[PDB]
Amino acid sequence: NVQNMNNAGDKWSAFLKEQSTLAQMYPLQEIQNLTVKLQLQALQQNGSSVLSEDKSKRLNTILNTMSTIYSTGKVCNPDNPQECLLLEPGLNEIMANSLDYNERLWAWESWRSEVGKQLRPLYEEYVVLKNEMARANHYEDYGDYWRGDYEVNGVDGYDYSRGQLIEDVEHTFEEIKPLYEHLHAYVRAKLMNAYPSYISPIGCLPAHLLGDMWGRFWTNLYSLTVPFGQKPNIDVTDAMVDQAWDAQRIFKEAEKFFVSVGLPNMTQGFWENSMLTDPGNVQKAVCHPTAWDLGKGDFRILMCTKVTMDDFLTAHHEMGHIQYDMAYAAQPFLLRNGANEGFHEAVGEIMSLSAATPKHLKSIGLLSPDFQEDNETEINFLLKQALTIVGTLPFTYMLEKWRWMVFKGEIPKDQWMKKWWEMKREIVGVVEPVPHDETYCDPASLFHVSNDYSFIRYYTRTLYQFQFQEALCQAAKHEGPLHKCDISNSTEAGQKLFNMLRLGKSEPWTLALENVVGAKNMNVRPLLNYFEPLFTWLKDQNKNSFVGWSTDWSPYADQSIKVRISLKSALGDKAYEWNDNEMYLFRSSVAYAMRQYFLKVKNQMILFGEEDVRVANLKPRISFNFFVTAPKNVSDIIPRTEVEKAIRMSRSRINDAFRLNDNSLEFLGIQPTLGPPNQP
Amino acid sequence: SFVGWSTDWSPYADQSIKVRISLKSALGDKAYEWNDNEMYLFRSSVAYAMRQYFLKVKNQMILFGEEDVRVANLKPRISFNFFVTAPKNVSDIIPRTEVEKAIRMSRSRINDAFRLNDNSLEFLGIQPTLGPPNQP
Amino acid sequence: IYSTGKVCNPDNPQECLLLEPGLNEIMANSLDYNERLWAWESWRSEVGKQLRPLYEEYVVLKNEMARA
Ligand SMILES: *[C@@H]1O[C@H](CO)[C@@H](O[C@@H]2O[C@H](CO)[C@@H](O)[C@H](O)[C@H]2NC(C)=O)[C@H](O)[C@H]1NC(C)=O
Ligand SMILES: *[C@@H]1O[C@H](CO)[C@@H](O[C@@H]2O[C@H](CO)[C@@H](O)[C@H](O)[C@H]2NC(C)=O)[C@H](O)[C@H]1NC(C)=O
Ligand SMILES: *[C@@H]1O[C@H](CO)[C@@H](O[C@@H]2O[C@H](CO)[C@@H](O)[C@H](O)[C@H]2NC(C)=O)[C@H](O)[C@H]1NC(C)=O
Ligand SMILES: *[C@@H]1O[C@H](CO)[C@@H](O[C@@H]2O[C@H](CO)[C@@H](O)[C@H](O)[C@H]2NC(C)=O)[C@H](O)[C@H]1NC(C)=O
């Protein structure tokens, strides 16, 4: 079957480049109808193939090499080199379940460093080749090529520029920063009880204590940050196995939700062709929830559903992709997508929000008609939402802002990892535990960076999701808070939803938003109205706390020693210049001095290397900080009092290696002491 | 043919350089003792000198380490042979003529790290050359 | 350690060869000087180091059992 789909897959791809090279026979500005212009521009798009034919095969070699490094990485446990852990099984489980500080610090660092280095040279060669392909298609860089999805040209008042997306993201983000600061302060106060003597009460959060490998979602911090742990968060999984609900009941109650709002039934080919469970055969078949739109009005759902409220909800999510697909099936073929890249997931998740409410669960038969929702359980529910929704918004905004500045050249390649960690402390409020120089590439250790994907679609989908939900609940005549809303039994709300679903790509997306919301731009005020019961409760829990963070604190910067070097004072017109070969000799001289101290004082032999001296904050005056680490235990920092005694023992030897004289090589905090004079 | 073998030949011992160190001649009653921490500092000073030669002459950046300097035949008089290898290619030995040019470029820096004076740190086969005198 | 040793090819760290399949085939079939020199050294060094401390502790305990 794989050979059955590779030849049938290439007949589709070879056919499309043949019609693409036929499309440049027609000019594009001699067209008047907006629909036939939109189909022509989506087919005329050259994309690749604008490069030289030896540069085009170099780019595909880089994209295949970066993709197989990410999926085949082995991490070695420094106590047993015969057991290598590989990213998805084993390294993702440590970052999501462990409470050991030293084991989370190990998994972060190792993985990072290794994959980092590899993806470095490759990613560097990837930026040059992608900017050449974008400038041959008349964009300024590859970041402007990614923002071409949101572009709208000449439809009388609904236009949108590719540079206008940058201001609308930064204008909407500075209204989330009051809400994110109070969530950052509450999580920091709860993490100090889980990790004492590791977290500052006025500083950033360490990057390896956030719940996963990159801090993208904070959703694994719920067991440490739960407001009222003596109240069970509502879970209807036992009431499903007490009424003998089969595999088919979960979709038939899902189809009754959509026919309740005024949307069509399933297509009745949906029930035979689909595969709602893994089969009765032990059948090798990728088990991953998804919605297929094969064509010719044939819609199938592929998932392996278990009787759980989790897959009761993603059944409502995956059916939402189908009802979006069944609506625009009357457009031409090249306009059968969502209106932008963000609308398709956003319509799927407002079906899941409306089905997870306890108002909907007690009317669908799954909750005791004598159930009492208290105000303590609504805080437990809203905080679990904010760890996934609000916690991912400064991560998404910071990452696309870094990638946009790399493509246009505002960040040169000698400052990639310098500007990356300055933007973590300032925007996200997250500090690294170990300093990282320009041999690492920490963005490329994420999936979407090393596999060539755009990331701004996760920011805009979060904002469209609550704009849709607030506009539908005013049509369904809701009375309470926004997070209690349900659009069942309405017809007027579904008519408000169906007027957008059938457009496809035939209209500009700004014209699609006014059919539901009533505005021409994305707005953050419906997102904040969802979380005002949490924002009121959060401001009362932070009366004795400090809201905000300092970008100066680090988890290593209290065992560091500052070094200051004055070369032109000692030698003057005859002094060498301080390149990074002199930094290599300095790190070997400190590692030599630590070896001599532990042998002659502590009677131990420890093999310190130059890779165990970690240098941060290199300035032009020639100043940096350093701290010393045990040879393969990255979590073991030698204390500052033992490094001062080691440097005092061998200060005369370090001075002679650089021709300095204790006034041109200063260790700040260590002073020369002895020397009584006399002789007469 | 020749029947039998010699126990003196080695496949690396024609790109090796012999080093001789006379500690008690340079300092005398006040000289440190040569443990294996001093051999670690010597292997880092040679790796530093190979880094500076390839950057300023060959315009390349190569990350030589102390594990790329291979020391053999350590004696009590303080003498050994060493040869330099490319950073992870164990089969690539840097030639003897390129290591002599790298040591000549940074001999004054290696001497200062050990307080020796070109008669107490001898690289056998490399000689000091310059120094014309005058002033009147 | 002897039965589960991985050797990494310095041009692709994502492919580790383990003694009986792959490292014994290089030493028995190759005519490349630089590839035989790599397989010898690598394997040697790694397993070498490990078996060192262990083998050192093994001599002391086996001499105690023999002298009793
Ligand atoms: C060009 O634009 C016109 C309107 O601007 C489209 O005309 C409509 O076409 C459909 C079927 O093709 C008719 O049912 C409508 O009644 C037409 N509208 C009007 C106002 O006459 C036309 O379809 C566009 N061209 C293409 C190829 O789609
Ligand atoms: C697709 O690539 C072609 C080049 O192969 C681009 O085209 C040319 O258009 C100019 C006019 O601007 C002509 O003078 C050239 O003759 C065309 N190419 C040649 C030499 O055949 C074209 O602009 C690209 N299309 C897109 C999507 O921008
Ligand atoms: C849930 O509602 C109850 C009922 O109002 C709240 O209890 C009140 O809390 C305030 C502030 O601490 C007190 O001044 C009142 O006297 C309490 N009412 C009673 C009847 O004792 C409770 O604080 C609410 N919980 C949350 C999380 O909002
Ligand atoms: C929302 O829709 C459901 C589904 O039709 C309605 O549920 C019915 O409720 C009545 C009385 O409450 C029962 O006698 C029926 O058996 C229910 N039908 C099903 C299929 O379970 C519900 O009443 C509707 N809500 C409103 C306010 O009309």
Ligand SMILES: *[C@@H]1O[C@H](CO)[C@@H](O[C@@H]2O[C@H](CO)[C@@H](O)[C@H](O)[C@H]2NC(C)=O)[C@H](O)[C@H]1NC(C)=O
């Ligand atoms: C690496 O160093 C850390 C200390 O920084 C070690 O953690 C200690 O582990 C022991 C037992 O495992 C505990 O009794 C100590 O309380 C731990 N120290 C701290 C500060 O938490 C860790 O064991 C070291 N790892 C290795 C492999 O030696």
Ligand SMILES: *[C@@H]1O[C@H](CO)[C@@H](O[C@@H]2O[C@H](CO)[C@@H](O)[C@H](O)[C@H]2NC(C)=O)[C@H](O)[C@H]1NC(C)=O
């Ligand atoms: C390691 O160094 C050796 C040389 O000592 C390299 O072998 C050369 O390989 C090229 C092509 O592979 C041949 O043209 C040369 O004739 C080889 N040299 C010798 C002396 O045989 C080897 O390629 C290097 N390995 C790496 C990974 O760089």
Ligand SMILES: *[C@@H]1O[C@H](CO)[C@@H](O)[C@H](O)[C@H]1NC(C)=O
């Ligand atoms: C959808 O199907 C049900 C039975 O499966 C049927 O009763 C209902 O009328 C259908 N909806 C419409 C709009 O016909």
Ligand SMILES: [Zn+2]
């Ligand atoms: Zn989805």
